[PDB]
């Protein structure tokens, strides 16, 4: 589930 980043943090 939701294993990804779009906006770097």
């Amino acid at each position, epitope marked *: *589930k*939701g*294993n*990804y980043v*779009v*906006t*770097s943090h």
Partner: antibody
Amino acid sequence: EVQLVESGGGLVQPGGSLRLSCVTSGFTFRKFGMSWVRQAPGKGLEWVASIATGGHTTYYSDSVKGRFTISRDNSKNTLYLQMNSLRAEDTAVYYCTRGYSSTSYAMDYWGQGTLVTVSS
Amino acid sequence: DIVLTQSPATLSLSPGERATLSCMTSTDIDDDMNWYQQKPGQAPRLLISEGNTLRPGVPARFSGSGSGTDFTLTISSLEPEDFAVYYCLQSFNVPLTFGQGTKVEIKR
């Protein structure tokens, strides 16, 4: 308004390399995730790679992992795809695309595509 | 990888009829389904994003429903410009995966 313009495609021999570029306009590029999606002739859509706003975090399809590298230059509104060790089955129209939200790579805007043909 | 199964692969209908397009997933993807339209020679267009959200500018006759494993795109009454290919896309996880497409074609 929003424009995504691909370039760098063309004919290449198996084993060869190409580098695609996509230059964007009409939005603050560095605030958006970006992806490449391809479509082989007569076939459906296939996601290739994605990159986060900062340009460090990247994702790849298993078909291209280790051969393709996605990167971006936020000072030039530009997305790249470095394509190495190309194979016939990589032949497709490659589209530059924008993730529609700060948390999703689902694509809203698409370029016109650039054709890549791999053949001996 | 999550598999999206679109059916029917071809939907044969006339202008004015209701179009129902199905997309089923190999695992529960909550509501992270997206629907695209594509015409010949053209780049795809996003119709519906995550949460069955209708995109600004897209006609009201398009609507998405369902969540979990079974998703539907409905075109309430087909216009001539709606005969085209439609793809579903899950954005729940990487790798991002698409269905193989449904062609809405003209019945005669």
